[PDB]
Write a protein that binds this DNA or RNA. Structure first.
Ligand SMILES: [K+]
Ligand SMILES: [K+]
Ligand SMILES: [K+]
Ligand SMILES: [K+]
Ligand SMILES: [K+]
Ligand SMILES: [K+]
Ligand SMILES: [K+]
Ligand SMILES: [K+]
Ligand SMILES: [K+]
Ligand SMILES: [K+]
Ligand SMILES: [Mg+2]
Ligand SMILES: [Mg+2]
Ligand SMILES: [Mg+2]
Length: 1326
RNA sequence: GGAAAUUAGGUGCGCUUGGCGUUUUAGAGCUAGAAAUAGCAAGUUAAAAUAAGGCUAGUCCGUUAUCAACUUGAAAAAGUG
DNA sequence: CAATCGCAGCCAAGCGCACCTAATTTCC
DNA sequence: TGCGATTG
């Protein structure tokens, strides 16, 4: 007995099958364990393991971060209360107590129910005077009176608890006063530079236009509209856009040859502005300087809507402005509706269930839902004009705590906090002594490069401490070693050099690393002129001159530069041809030119004695992100540099790391020559060996020194790159193989054939930015979920224009258009947007075989470049559209694409093959060589997909889960037959160890040996005999006389081992919504002492697993003991306490005299068999899932495939006639579903509705009936019931919301393959 | 089948932050009526919680991965037809 | 009991490293 | 899709 294994690896399934050399699946008797009548059972060696999707760690990570921030937000308040503690005890010794118990009902409170003052008259008067906390905040900022210490605390705590963001660096000092004066100064600055065409201010209310509650682009339009003759994209318009915070492009303003984009917020602005001024001149400096001055006065116009001269709390005053205008408009809205719509007053102001004002304040109506409900009511009335204006600006009846408050920087809250401290420290000395302490509570942010402030019990932490003591926001710099922590942050993640594993890789922007990349590319450049017979390398003397002249003067070196400014102007070559570099060199000395601008000392950079210092500087600039820590690490070099360059050097920050170490490129030396790798790249006689040749040359010592420098199965797979969903199936695949090997008596298989299976928010954002750079108004002309349509998505990505013809596209005629593939689908199976365009007709592309024709590229390339700059097409999409001008698809390209259709190239699939190969092949030769006992073959899905369709082994996925197992069987058959027929293909499919046209036709007809007659692509008919053999062997590969019948017999076998992986449920305890209190006791307490009948709580806890309990419970008033057998759900929250002491946990639930040895742990999907073969799976402790599979005969599967594809060659008429000749199969398929449902589904109401729905459409076309019959299998599918539709009839799911019947059924414990079973008759228990 | 560089597009893991929401309580509802109710007034804010909790007591940890049964084992895992 | 209807925490910012695919140049 | 609530 020799055998092979077929495998189909998916995200939710692993199909498997064992075949013999006759392509047959064996059957075998397996022992059955347990206490039932059955001692053994026959099983076919074919099946599929099913499992729920494996999840990434992202959701767990976001919740872990949220917990840390709630812990730290609470500590900020605790820090503040500790500071107030001693003095607050003298004012009100129970104030903080009332704050902590504010949530408790009055019955549970220990102090008086009014938290602030402890009595009702004082509490009522507070809210009367300060209706919002911002009323109190502004008053404490602007008033000189001594304030109650309790009100001081509440205002400071409110700023510290909700402190604002940290997206702006440095200090913020808002100043509203000079918006008009600064705009006039920018106009005056602009007119002095363009006296010929000045701009008239002329009472243009710049303060109103720029500070208005509109978008930056909208206010830019309103300002430009007030200036006749000025365009929005003109020079003055871009300056206004710059002051607003946009990203204008000054390229067209100055007729530049490159983009000149500027935005003041990016740290690159100072360099970018200097780059622009270097081209246009320094007389434009005051132009952008005055633009920055105006930008500071309107920087906070979105959040600060009050003139800053009358208050030092403009944020709170802006909130007060919201409150007052809310009061004024509410009084006006109420008086209006009383007069004009008195009937709808109750619904608008009393009905919480409606989206009126009541639902806005008391119900669940959002601000957006409230505006939508009230807008038609406002338009019906008069006069609501100003209310309509405020509504469309989202400024009507506004609250103060709103979704859009995220734009408020922490410096704003800090300003008000600092002012309150300054006011009240004159009366409270402890506020003076603790002023900077309190401000530090608000401003201090744990650096992201420090991480959690742990002390040995965090697997996520890396921080180290200077001193062993508790870390506070005030001693953080002294207790935490920021330098070591910031270094460990990067050090724990960066690669080591694979060639020298003990050596870290160099920074990507290291000078020595960029020298390495330049010389490695330079050393393979050849040249030829009219005199020399054959091309020659560049000499070591030539490389140095080329580097010194071109690379050290220009950031990029073009091939034209090399030819013109070197070979001609220094070598006396009137002409020269260059090979090894195209257009321009890929490598460059970018860091060399960055430092040359900063330190201005070219001699210092070219002095190789300064090599170690420059590598240390770049290492510091790469390792650290805090520019103060950077400045501290550059102190040892403060004598070579003045203070001006040091200020520029500490701003030059780098990111990224290279692939090689400094010891590899310029450290280790060849023993004979004493030269490093970089030395050989600089000069290597006339051989000019590059990096790959040097470390592989057996005549040098680099190769042996690198060779001299050179995990469980679960950890290895987890550490692989790829989706954690496919990685779950990879581990299960290995476990299936291990079991299948032991099933075959631990004999290894001959072959293992593996095959691995192959939004709306991003689409909208990608189009809005694209048309913005495009300048088009197509989004405004014809305005998310609609972009799920493929054609409409391509329509907007192409600005409503044809990609092949340069003509407009009618958006209401998208059905008349064609979605054509850039690279034809016959070569590349790319269904993504990167390979699709929208055109009037696919004939506009040109020929069908190749890339769009030359005439199309010459006419449309300009249009494609604009779409590329607007990020509407990727660089890959632009490259393959313009490929015709580069010659188009070569004959080797077409063959390469057709080999890619057969040979799997994904790295993740190669890892699976390597894992199986290394686990199977472990013995060695007499010469210490690996003995490959098992060939691991990798196939792509198209090979079996085409095999199914050629020979009518059709697949209908909705019928059952057998298709996963059948795919694995077909993988083994096709894979082993292909390797047996053509052993030379083992180099392409087996892991380990003219001509273009031939390889194209060879790879195109590689599967023809299965057929008897072949109609070729050339049109010529070929014939093959019945039995196929191997060339040199003569062994029989395929017998078309009985091997197809073998496949038909295998695929028609009803007994297939479908196994749903039982799994303990993990994750959140329950649903997260905090529901209001209800007398129903389903609610779960949110804290230990928060009775949900008083405080509300959670619903629907998740059961981790169920347990079978055989015990007694107390019944009735007398508490009689009554023997019971029950299924108890152990929730995720309860799991730890249950497992710590099961008996104590069960006794606490009310069970007595528990049979401890009869407790069975029953995770989700636990399998039970009842009567007549009916099976049920545990959905939980209180619901069951369907446990049976409907094995529909093969003749019905093939009929359902052809009849449903009836609308979609000359032989298609034979398949169409088969459908009409077997229209009676519809009744027979319904009968199969009915008998199956009556036997195992037991949903008579839904079956009657199904049969009634089938009879109503018996005159419908056979295609439509077959399509809807496929929907009916949802009724019979394995797993959780789900709704489905037969034509227009909807059949809602019939759930099995009772688990009592399984308590006396047969529990089935299945191995991973389902071949080994332990069956427990639970009726004997109890 | 690999390596480096360049260009472009993605994925994973980890850290540090912001704003909402929701829950209970506080923000004296008034007049009439025996009451059911009716007519008005009012509404924008805050505290506290945001997995129960844990010991290791940290400004730490608490939702990923992994899991038939039986025997062994803390676990990982091994053995069993 | 069943048949039936209802419900589910979300939005945003910054940073670091490591992978992957897919084109080009030079090589093993 | 597991379960809470409502209706029949
Ligand atoms: K009380
Ligand atoms: K204008
Ligand atoms: K609301
Ligand atoms: K609400
Ligand atoms: K709120
Ligand atoms: K190039
Ligand atoms: K850095
Ligand atoms: K899990
Ligand atoms: K899960
Ligand atoms: K199992
Ligand atoms: Mg907590
Ligand atoms: Mg809130
Ligand atoms: Mg937050």
């Amino acid at each position: 007995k020799k055998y092979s294994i077929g495998l189909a690896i998916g995200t939710n399934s692993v199909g498997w099958a064992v075949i013999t050399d006759e392509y047959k699946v064996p059957s075998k008797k397996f022992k059955v364990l347990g206490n039932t009548d059955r001692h053994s059972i026959k099983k076919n060696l074919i099946g599929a393991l099913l499992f729920d999707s494996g999840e990434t760690a992202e959701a767990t990570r976001l919740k872990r971060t949220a917990r840390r921030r709630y812990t730290r937000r609470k500590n900020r308040i605790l820090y503040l209360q500790e500071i107030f503690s001693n003095e607050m005890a003298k004012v009100d010794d129970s104030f903080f107590h009332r704050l902590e118990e504010s949530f408790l009902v009055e019955e549970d409170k220990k102090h008086e129910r009014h938290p602030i003052f402890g009595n009702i008259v004082d509490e009522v008067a507070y809210h009367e005077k300060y209706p919002t906390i911002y009323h109190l905040r502004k008053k404490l900022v602007d008033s000189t009176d001594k304030a109650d210490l309790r009100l001081i605390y509440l205002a400071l705590a409110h700023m510290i608890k909700f402190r604002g963001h940290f997206l702006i660096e440095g200090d913020l000092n808002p100043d509203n006063s000079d918006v008009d004066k600064l705009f006039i100064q920018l106009v005056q600055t602009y007119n002095q530079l363009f006296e010929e065409n000045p701009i008239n201010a002329s009472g243009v209310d710049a303060k109103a236009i720029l500070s208005a509650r509109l978008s930056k682009s909208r206010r830019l339009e309103n300002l430009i509209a007030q200036l006749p003759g000025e365009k929005k994209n003109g020079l003055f318009g871009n300056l206004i856009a710059l002051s607003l915070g946009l990203t204008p492009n000054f390229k067209s303003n100055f007729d530049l040859a490159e983009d000149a984009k500027l935005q003041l917020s990016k740290d690159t602005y100072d360099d970018d502005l200097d780059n622009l001024l270097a081209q246009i001149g320094d007389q434009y400096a005051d132009l952008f300087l005055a633009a920055k001055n105006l930008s500071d006065a309107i920087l906070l116009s979105d959040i600060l809507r009050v003139n800053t001269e009358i208050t030092k709390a403009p944020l709170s005053a802006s909130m007060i402005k919201r409150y007052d205008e809310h009061h004024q408009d509410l009084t006006l809205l109420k008086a209006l509706v009383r007069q004009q719509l008195p009937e709808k007053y109750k619904e608008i102001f009393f009905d919480q269930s409606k989206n009126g004002y009541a639902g806005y304040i008391d119900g669940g109506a959002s601000q957006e839902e409230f505006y939508k409900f009230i807008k038609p009511i406002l338009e019906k009335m008069d006069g609501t004009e100003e209310l309509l204006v405020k509504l469309n600006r989202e400024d009507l009846l506004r609250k103060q705590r709103t979704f859009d408050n995220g734009s408020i920087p922490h410096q704003i809250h800090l300003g008000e906090l600092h002012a309150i401290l300054r006011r009240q420290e004159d009366f409270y000395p402890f506020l003076k002594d603790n002023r900077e302490k309190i401000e530090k509570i608000l401003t201090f942010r744990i650096p992201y490069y420090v991480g959690p402030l742990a002390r040995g019990n965090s697997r996520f932490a890396w921080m180290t401490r200077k001193s062993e003591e508790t870390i506070t926001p005030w001693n953080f710099e002294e207790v935490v070693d920021k330098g070591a922590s910031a270094q460990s942050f990067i050090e724990r993640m960066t690669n080591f050099d694979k060639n020298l594993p003990n050596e870290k890789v160099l920074p990507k922007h290291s000078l020595l690393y960029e020298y390495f990349t330049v010389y490695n590319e330079l050393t393979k450049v050849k040249y030829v002129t009219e005199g020399m017979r054959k091309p020659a390398f560049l000499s070591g003397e030539q490389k140095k001159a080329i580097v010194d002249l071109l690379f050290k003067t220009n950031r990029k070196v073009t091939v034209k530069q090399l030819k013109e400014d070197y070979f001609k102007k220094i070598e006396e070559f009137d002409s020269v041809e260059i090979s090894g570099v195209e257009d321009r060199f890929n490598a460059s000395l970018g860091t060399y030119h960055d430092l040359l601008k900063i330190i201005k000392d070219k001699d210092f950079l070219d002095n190789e004695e300064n090599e170690d210092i420059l590598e240390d500087i770049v290492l510091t600039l790469t390792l650290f992100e805090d520019r103060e820590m950077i400045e501290e690490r550059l102190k040892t070099y403060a004598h070579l540099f003045d203070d001006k360059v040091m200020k520029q050097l500490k701003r030059r920050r780098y990111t990224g790391w290279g692939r090689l170490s400094r010891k590899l490129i310029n450290g280790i030396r060849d023993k004979q020559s004493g030269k490093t790798i970089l030395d050989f790249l600089k000069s290597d006689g006339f051989a000019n060996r590059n990096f790959m040749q040097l470390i592989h040359d057996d005549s040098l010592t680099f190769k042996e020194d690198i060779q001299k420098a050179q995990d469980s199965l679960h950890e290895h797979i987890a550490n692989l790159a790829g989706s954690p969903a496919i990685k779950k199936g990879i581990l299960q695949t290995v476990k299936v193989v291990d079991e299948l090997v032991k099933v075959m008596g631990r004999h290894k298989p001959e072959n293992i054939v593996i095959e691995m299976a192959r939004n709306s928010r991003e689409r909208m954002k990608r189009i809005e930015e694209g048309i913005k750079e495009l300048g088009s108004q197509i989004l405004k002309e014809h305005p998310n979920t609609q972009l799920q349509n493929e054609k409409l998505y391509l329509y907007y990505l192409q600005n409503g224009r044809d990609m092949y013809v340069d003509q407009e596209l009618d958006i209401n005629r998208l059905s008349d258009y064609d979605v054509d593939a850039i690279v034809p689908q016959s070569f590349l199976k790319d269904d993504s947007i990167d390979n699709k365009v929208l055109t009037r007709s696919d004939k506009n592309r040109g020929k069908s075989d190749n890339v769009p024709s030359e005439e199309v590229v010459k006419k449309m390339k300009n249009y494609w470049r604009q779409l590329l700059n607007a990020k509407l097409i990727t660089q890959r999409k632009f490259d393959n559209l313009t490929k015709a001008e580069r010659g188009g698809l070569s004959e080797l390209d077409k063959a390469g694409f057709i080999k890619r259709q057969l040979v799997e190239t994904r790295q993740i699939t190669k890892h699976v093959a390597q894992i199986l190969d290394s686990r199977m092949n472990t013995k060695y030769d007499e010469n210490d060589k690996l003995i490959r006992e098992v060939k691991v073959i990798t196939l792509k899905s198209k090979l079996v997909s085409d095999f199914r369709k050629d020979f009518q082994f059709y697949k209908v996925r909705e019928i059952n889960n057998y298709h996963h197992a059948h795919d694995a069987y077909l993988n083994a058959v096709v894979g082993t037959a292909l390797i047996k027929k053509y052993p030379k293909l083992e180099s392409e499919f087996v892991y380990g160890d003219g001509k273009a046209t031939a390889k194209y036709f060879f790879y195109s007809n590689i599967m023809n040996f299965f057929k008897t007659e072949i109609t070729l692509a050339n049109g010529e008919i070929r014939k093959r005999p019945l039995i196929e053999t191997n060339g040199e062997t003569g062994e029989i590969v395929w017998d078309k006389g009985r091997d197809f019948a073998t496949v038909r017999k295998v695929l028609s076998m009803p007994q297939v081992n479908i196994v749903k992986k039982t799994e303990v449920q993990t994750g959140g305890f329950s649903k997260e919504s905090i529901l209001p209190k209800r007398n129903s006791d389903k609610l779960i307490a949110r804290k230990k002492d928060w009775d949900p009948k008083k405080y509300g709580g959670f619903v629907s806890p998740t059961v981790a697993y169920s347990v079978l309990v055989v015990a007694k419970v107390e019944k009735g008033k007398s508490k009689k003991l009554k023997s019971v057998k029950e299924l108890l759900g152990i929730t995720i929250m309860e799991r730890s306490s249950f497992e710590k002491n099961p008996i104590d946990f069960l006794e606490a639930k009310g069970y007595k005299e528990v049979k401890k040895d009869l407790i069975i742990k029953l995770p989700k999907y636990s399998l039970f068999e009842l009567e007549n073969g009916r099976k049920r799976m545990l959905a939980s402790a209180r619901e069951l899932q369907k446990g049976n599979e409907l094995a529909l005969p093969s003749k019905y599967v093939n009929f359902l495939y052809l009849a449903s594809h009836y609308e979609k060659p000359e032989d298609n008429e034979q398949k169409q006639l088969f459908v009409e000749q077997h229209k009676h199969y519809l009744d027979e398929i319904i009968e199969q579903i009915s008998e199956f449902s009556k036997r195992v589904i037991l949903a008579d109401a839904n079956l009657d509705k199904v049969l009634s729905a089938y009879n109503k459409h018996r005159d419908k076309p056979i295609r439509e009936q077959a399509e809807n019959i496929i929907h009916l299998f949802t009724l019979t599918n394995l797993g959780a019931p789900a709704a489905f539709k037969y034509f227009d009839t909807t059949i809602d799911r019939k759930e099995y919301r009772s688990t009592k019947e399984v308590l006396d059924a047969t529990l089935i414990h299945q191995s991973i393959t389902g071949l080994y079973e332990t069956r427990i008759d639970l009726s004997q228990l109890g």
